Design a protein around this nucleic acid. Structure first.
Lengths: 94, 88, 98, 781, 110, 92, 110, 82, 98
DNA sequence: TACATGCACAGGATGTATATATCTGACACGTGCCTGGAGACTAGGGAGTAATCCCCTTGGCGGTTAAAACGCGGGGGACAGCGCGTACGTGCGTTTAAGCGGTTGCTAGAGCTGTCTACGACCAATTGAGCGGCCTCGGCACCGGGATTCTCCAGGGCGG
DNA sequence: CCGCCCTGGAGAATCCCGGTGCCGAGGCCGCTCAATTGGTCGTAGACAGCTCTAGCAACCGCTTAAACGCACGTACGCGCTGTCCCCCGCGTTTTAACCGCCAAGGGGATTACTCCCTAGTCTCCAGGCACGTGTCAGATATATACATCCTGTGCATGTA
């Protein structure tokens, strides 16, 4: 049975930030749990944000507001940057 | 020099000493030291910035400039402090 | 003459304010403080009155609960006077300082 | 009755009673002649030892044996005030009051006497407030009214007659029991008035029962004999005839006479006519502003001395004393309590505070002074007064119509609730004949119910008042703030400000602030000082920056120099007290003796400033006001010029502002200069104010107290004037049929200054300013 | 020939609206499908919890000689019952006040 | 048209206390309480359906959410109330 | 011609899967509709947070002379950074240990 | 029949946990209190995990149910799936 | 005979166990305790080994954080020895007890 | 003999209790209506059930060795008592600002109605990215022998 | 001559460097399912317009209770000292955790078939939200009857 995970994406992000550093199975499982937990928090906050404003759709505005609500301080304002240009780059292509 | 600044800066001092004493009386405090009030003002300020920042975020998501009571309710819930009596 | 003992007036105030339910902070200084804090995050902010009422109710509830924890800290240290170290201990155990 | 649902959860029962008793704390809880007020002090304690050792300063123990103090004691009557000494007192309660008196009066008086940096103006101001305090305290000795008498038994003194005495400026909680003999000996007239009030022939129980059967009223060509007073004038007697004729028809009215015509005397004489002639001597109520209420009390004391007029103010104890000592003839009964008084004077605050205790009284007449306060039908005062059970009501005002027709509708619905309806406003863009017919219908509908007489129709000695509108261009700083606000520029509005807290809520408020002065904005003087005066701020470029920051200030400076050159005194009215702060600083660095009145000034300093400005030996030249302060009772006889720095939305507020100096008895031609910023939001302020004056001139002025054919033309002409925009030897204090006279003082006189940075503060002023700055460094301070 | 319509609350013997709870479950983004007995069960549980707090608050109002439940009575009822206290531990009731208690070391003497 | 729970709370109050009223603020507090308990139980049941790869929310998920959220005797009494309500609704 | 099927992650310049995040948002019962830029923004935020922890954890592995990240390095990186400690304040990392911290009262006095 | 297994959490184990917590001196009455609070905590987590197991109609208790039970109590654990 | 002063060994174990990573409770006693607690709820329960391991990690993290707050309570009361009342105060302020 | 003064008795005015009529606040109820809930029918997919694989978890011996239990001495820390001084409570007199009511125009924002378009859901064909399986070999764990670093106690030297 | 402090050396603990080996980290490959692309279409939300109400800025007046400043007394926090007891360090003995292995058996996870429950749709109808009124209960006014106290005049006595 095919089981999906964020292992290859965490690994290639690690090779970006540290090209000569490895990782273990337990640390990869912890990274997968972290990514799943943060995804669940941001998606739940955006779902509640769309519900409070009587909207049927989740757009990048709700995810941006969820990131500003959940991420503390400067870690928010870089991430708000890192999402935004990505959307802009997506707009440059699709 | 009768003219001066329009804005007021020591609005944290509007939380007066007898108000902090009354709040401690509701908490069952018998004796209060004199250094309590500045620490209480700092704690109140930190709590108020934490709630008000999230409420302003909820206000700006709705493309509004008026902070409603429901935004204050949503903000407190997200900080783990559910408040009844204003949700309806 | 007839001066009261130091402590019985405090006990009368404890027994009075633990029975009552009104807000212990005047409304206008709290509105001024909320507007002063809120203008740092965003300029030209309007406020509904019930928003400031809810902020006041939450603020006094938070401070009263913190004062109960602070009093427990002061009693634990063989004292009856609350000190700033009791507030830092209560907020450290609660996870606000941790 | 019985619950149909119960809980199966096995919880323990809980006492939810949160009521507490402090009885166990009674172990630490329980188990009137003292010092109240210290009035005056004398430098000789017992005898004059000598004039030596008059230098240095005394200490507290030195003053403990050198001075004797006048003491009013606790629960006393200001007649048992004793000259005492610290050793003669011992240890009573209230010694801290004596210590505080001795401390601040003696040490502050001796340091203001012995300082070298004390001018003559400060010492005469301190002397006049010193004697003002002594005259206010000496007024308390005189009785004003005797409330009740009793027979009290003293310590083996058999029976003594004891009077309950109220004092002049004191209230009913200072009413005291006193001996009869000295009270008769010092003021027997009040005692005689008390026995006249005792077996009086006029009571509410002796009132007639006119129920739609009131007798016809004949016109009185002479003053009636029961109104003693002074002498009623002809227009006042005509007003008496009008109020009596309206009462005989069972109708209510508005006495819309202008201020200074004595509306108080007219309604007191009408109350006297209602009591004496028609025998309607029951409970009447007059609701007045608190500031004018002594002027009602002495009017009742002078013109109607036989009446039982009572005064209803004060705290809970004083009003309780009035309630259970003076309302009822039989206060100790339990059934129907008949009323004892005739007239009750009260204020709006105690109408709202005591609507339960005063609404349950069958009032026979009601008189509301300053009824423009009743102009809002949704106000709490309107709901409180409209719920009263009153037969006949009357409104006394000067401005029945102020902003829109809805206020007049509220007034006539307070008077006659239902027979008059107003549902259509007045639009100047239509200007059709149907609106003119509606206006004439409103003319003919409220014509007999409003009596308005004008200060120009009677008393043929009043000088004319001329209003000149001066429109000045904006400065560069005002123009750039106007552009930054109007095209919102938060980044540009912040600029060099460290805090950057600029509030752009209420755009029109900020536009009016920019039209007045740039210095009303935060961190705005620093940019002007560092951009032109290069930041030195050495006492001479500050005034220049004040003058050329605003375009109104150059016209104000030229006007003040020209009026100082002539023999004129000037008032300046502003809508904001921060603008008054800017003008006060301008006249402080300018060096002009000014006095100021706004809402922050308490009433004692207000009366001090008014008496100082109106004294014949006054060095004051300029008197600044916030426009909506002080009420209608400010007397400004000596001033001649009125400058409206800031126009009001309500033109009646500017009308009372002009009428502070344009009272009855003015000896000089009053000149009004209105300062207007060009191409700004103040122009539509004046447009709305002009439209409101057109509306007030239509309904009220054409329905006061072959021309009907020309009315259909001149109403169309005044609607064409109201439908047109007014904005398309200057400063002379001189001026060389009524329909064309209203076309005056709506013209706009443009003023061009064209004064650059290097003209003002001339060689006379610059030499005086530089020598004062150089001499200040020599004397340090 | 439609039959006489009766509410789903009356079928389950409830006072709380089963249809409104079903509509809020369907539009609340909880699952793709909602079962038939789930709004009945949830309305019964909500009605029971309302009954518990309303009974305790009516007792609190009766003990303080009052005929209307105010927020103080709700706060006293919730905080005096430990199961309802820990159900609403992180819940602030507005205009509710606190439980009156003083620590024993702050008492003056025996 | 405000979509509140006030009338049903009033009927429940008349069931448990037929001669006791309720203020508007207390009614708002009860409305907020019912909404809070609704969203807690529905969120826990949604999570329970997602954890077991189920596309529907049944009375089993609501029952498990009730015994997960409510403590002690409250949980078992609410399970009893909901079970007999489901039984009464099914049979008729 | 199907234009070689360029993925959305390469279009957004990301290493996290935009398509998988879109499928998890659609199947996660969050809203009826999901916008096009929401998975892009969310995948970018997730990749940024992953890089932020992984760089500090690689630094922690380097400071203890290791070329492989273990859970101890992740715990040291999370607890030593002020904002990741607030993000993961109620989070246990298994086999993570604690920060070495001794209170100064307990230290010996010299 | 399993009984008296709370004494299997020995005194040196509690001392080691306190040493990791930074505790220098330990009173003799600490260990019974620590055993009691551990029993209360384990009862709460195990009861929620058994509820999650019983909902799934399963007899074994998986680690993922324990992760769910710790998530429900605000005590998120990384490294066992999720 | 050689002797250490009372306390330096305790600092040595504090430095040792704050550097270490492994579980400080033995596996079989914790597994037996988990099974005894679990049989009170449902009889005939099986357990994955990873379930017992996750329970052990959560339990030791809970106890280590509780001992940190207990040490803060003891230091606040001018003591270096932790008492059961310090655990009670820490759990009371944290909201677990009351 | 007549005028002035002390003492006792009977009828008139007043306060209070009670029956009846009127005003004011609340409560169930008539009416409209409208919108959300209910009844009836259809279809399809989610869920239930069965067969099969297979892997994992639950109950007894054997060694070994490190951890746990236990005893003992001692010393450091908890705790009680006492003294001191200072900071806080308390009362009182004075100021001040909160609270309330009020102006005046403009704008934000909720709510309702109507249009319309871009955008996301949905479906089919395609294909390439990601995942399970397999294999290997280097990063890291274990062990052994010095090197070094570290408190701890006793002895000599120096200052008081 | 005596007390304190530095230091010298003693042995325990830990670091460090080298060797060995082992087993998971990572790379390669087949495959197959989910992302991508292209097309169609319904509708969510943006936009526009109109109406009504709360908020906002800066000012006014009045009341009054709360805030504040100050002085004084005293309760309590803190520092110091003694004492005793309990916890810590260390050696010795026990014991059970840990690793490994045994034997079977049952619980949980893919693939196929079926069936029934719920979404969807249409139609109908009644539950609930507002108004607005007849009626009931509490409070108040009004007329009437009984208990209670102030008061004027006749009888008797003293005096010129």
């Amino acid at each position: 049975t095919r089981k999906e995970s964020y292992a290859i994406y965490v690994y290639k992000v690690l090779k970006q930030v540290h090209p000569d550093t490895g990782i273990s199975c337990k640390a990869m499982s912890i990274m997968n749990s972290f990514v799943n937990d943060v995804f669940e928090r941001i998606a739940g906050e955006a779902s509640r944000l769309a519900h409070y404003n009587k909207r049927s759709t989740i757009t990048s505005r709700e995810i941006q507001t969820a990131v500003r609500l959940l991420l503390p301080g400067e870690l928010a304002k870089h991430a708000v940057s890192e999402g935004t240009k990505a959307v802009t780059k997506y707009t440059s292509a699709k | 020099a009768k003219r001066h600044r329009k804005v007021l800066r020591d609005n944290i001092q509007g939380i007066t000493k007898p108000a902090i004493r009354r709040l401690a009386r509701r908490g069952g405090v018998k004796r209060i030291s004199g250094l309590i009030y500045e620490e209480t003002r700092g704690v109140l300020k930190v709590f108020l910035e934490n709630v008000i920042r999230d409420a302003v975020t909820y206000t700006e998501h709705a493309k509004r400039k008026t902070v409603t009571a429901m935004d204050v309710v949503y903000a407190l819930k997200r900080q783990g402090r559910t408040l009844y009596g204003f949700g309806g | 003459p007839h001066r009261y003992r130091p402590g019985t007036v405090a006990l009368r105030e404890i027994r009075r304010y633990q029975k009552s339910t009104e807000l212990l902070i005047r409304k206008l200084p709290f509105q001024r403080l909320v507007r002063e804090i809120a203008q740092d995050f965003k300029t030209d902010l309007r406020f509904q009155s019930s928003a400031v009422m809810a902020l006041q109710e939450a603020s006094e509830a938070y401070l009263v609960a913190l004062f109960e924890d602070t009093n427990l800290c002061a009693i634990h240290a063989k004292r009856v006077t609350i000190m700033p170290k009791d507030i830092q201990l209560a907020r450290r155990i609660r996870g606000e300082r941790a | 009755k019985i619950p149909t649902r119960f809980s199966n959860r096995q919880n323990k029962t809980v006492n939810y009673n949160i009521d507490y008793s402090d009885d166990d704390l009674l172990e630490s809880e329980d188990d009137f002649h003292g010092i109240d007020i210290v009035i005056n002090h004398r430098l000789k304690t017992s005898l004059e030892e000598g004039k030596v050792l008059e230098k240095t300063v005394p200490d507290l123990n030195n003053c403990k044996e050198n001075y004797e103090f006048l003491i009013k004691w606790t629960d006393e009557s200001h007649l048992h005030n004793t000259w005492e000494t610290y050793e003669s007192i011992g240890q009573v309660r209230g010694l801290k009051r004596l210590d505080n008196y001795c401390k601040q009066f003696i040490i502050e008086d001796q340091q203001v006497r012995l300082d070298p940096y004390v001018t003559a103006e400060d010492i005469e101001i301190m002397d006049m407030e010193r004697e003002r305090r002594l005259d206010e305290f000496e007024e308390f000795h005189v009785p004003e009214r005797i409330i009740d008498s009793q027979r009290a038994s003293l310590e083996d003194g058999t029976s003594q007659l004891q009077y309950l005495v109220k004092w002049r400026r004191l209230n009913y909680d200072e009413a005291t029991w006193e001996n009869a003999t000295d009270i008769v000996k010092l003021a027997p007239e009040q005692v005689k008035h008390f026995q006249n009030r005792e077996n009086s022939k006029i009571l509410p129980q002796y009132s007639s029962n006119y129920t739609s059967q009131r007798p016809r009223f004949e016109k009185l060509s002479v003053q009636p004999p029961f109104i003693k007073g002074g002498e009623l004038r002809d227009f006042q007697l005509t007003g008496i005839n009008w109020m009596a004729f309206l009462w005989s028809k069972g109708d209510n009215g508005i006495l819309a006479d202008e201020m200074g015509l004595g509306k108080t005397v007219q309604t007191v004489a009408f109350i006297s006519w209602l009591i004496f002639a028609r025998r309607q001597n029951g409970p009447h109520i007059i609701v007045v502003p608190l500031s004018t209420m002594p002027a009602w009390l002495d009017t009742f004391e002078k013109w109607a001395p036989d009446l039982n007029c009572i005064c209803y103010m004060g705290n809970q104890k004083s009003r309780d004393t009035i309630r259970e000592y003076e309302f009822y003839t039989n206060p100790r009964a339990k059934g129907k309590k008949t009323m004892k008084f005739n007239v009750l004077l009260t204020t709006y605050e105690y109408i709202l505070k005591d609507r339960a205790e005063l609404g349950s009284i069958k009032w026979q007449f009601m008189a509301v002074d300053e009824a423009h306060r009743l102009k809002n039908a949704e106000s709490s005062l309107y709901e409180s007064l409209n719920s009263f059970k009153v037969a006949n009501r009357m409104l006394i005002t000067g401005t029945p119509l102020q902003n829109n027709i809805k206020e007049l509708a509220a007034l006539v619905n307070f008077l006659m609730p239902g027979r008059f309806t107003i549902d259509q406003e007045i639009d100047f863009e239509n200007q059709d004949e149907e609106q003119e017919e509606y206006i004439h219908d409103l003319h003919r509908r409220i014509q007999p119910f409003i009596l308005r007489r004008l200060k120009k129709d009677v008393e043929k000695s009043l000088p004319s008042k001329t209003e000149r509108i001066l429109r000045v261009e904006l400065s560069d700083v005002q123009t750039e703030y106007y552009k930054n606000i109007l095209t919102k520029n938060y980044s540009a509005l912040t600029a060099g400000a460290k805090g950057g807290h600029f509030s752009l809520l209420n755009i029109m408020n900020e536009l009016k602030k920019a039209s007045n002065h740039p210095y009303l904005f935060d961190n705005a003087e620093e940019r002007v000082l560092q951009k032109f005066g290069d930041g030195k701020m050495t006492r001479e470029n500050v005034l220049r920056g004040l003058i050329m920051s605003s375009g109104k200030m150059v016209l104000l400076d030229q006007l003040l120099t020209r009026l100082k050159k002539d023999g004129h005194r000037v008032l300046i009215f502003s809508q904001m007290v921060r603008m008054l702060d800017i003008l006060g600083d301008y006249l402080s660095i300018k060096g002009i003796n000014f006095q100021r009145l706004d809402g922050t000034v308490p009433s004692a300093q207000r009366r001090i400033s008014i008496d100082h400005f109106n004294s014949p030996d006054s060095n004051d030249f300029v008197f600044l006001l916030s426009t909506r302060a002080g009420g209608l009772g400010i007397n400004l006889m000596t001033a001649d010029t009125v400058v409206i720095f800031d126009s009001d939305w309500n033109p009646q507020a500017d009308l009372q502002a002009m009428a502070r100096a344009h009272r009855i008895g003015q000896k000089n031609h009053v000149m009004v200069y209105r300062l207007v910023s060009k191409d700004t939001v103040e122009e539509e302020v004046l447009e709305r104010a002009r439209k409101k004056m057109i509306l007030e001139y239509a309904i009220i002025s054409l329905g006061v107290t072959k021309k009907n054919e020309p009315n259909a033309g001149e109403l169309s002409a005044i609607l064409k004037f109201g439908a047109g925009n007014m904005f398309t030897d200057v400063l002379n204090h001189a001026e060389d049929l009524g329909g064309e006279e209203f076309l005056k003082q709506f013209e706009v006189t443009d003023y061009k200054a064209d004064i650059d940075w290097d003209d003002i503060i001339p060689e006379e002023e610059l030499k005086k300013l530089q020598d004062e700055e150089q001499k200040r460094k020599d004397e340090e301070y | 020939t439609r039959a006489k319509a009766k509410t789903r609350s009356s079928r389950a013997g409830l006072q709380f609206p089963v249809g409104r709870v079903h509509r809020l479950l369907r539009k609340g983004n909880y699952a793709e499908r909602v079962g038939a007995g789930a709004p009945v069960y949830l309305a019964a549980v909500l009605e029971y919890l309302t009954a518990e707090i309303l009974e305790l608050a009516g007792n609190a109002a009766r003990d303080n000689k009052k005929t209307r439940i105010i927020p103080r009575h709700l706060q006293l009822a919730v905080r005096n019952d430990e199961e309802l206290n820990k159900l609403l531990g992180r819940v602030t009731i507005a205009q509710g006040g606190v439980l009156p208690n003083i620590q024993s070391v702050l008492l003056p003497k025996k």
